[PDB]
# Entry
Amino acid sequence: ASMGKSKEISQDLRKRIVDLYKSGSSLGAISKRLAVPRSSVQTIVRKYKHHGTTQHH
# Structure
């Protein structure tokens, strides 16, 4: 498993934020650690929130 693994430096951070967002604290985790989500976190979370609510296939 060498061809994949952590593609994009920020991907691991994105995964950690989204995991916390879906399981518990959504904005508390972002506000405390990241402080300002910006468009970067907001666009990713908007799509993920939809998938977390009801993912359509």
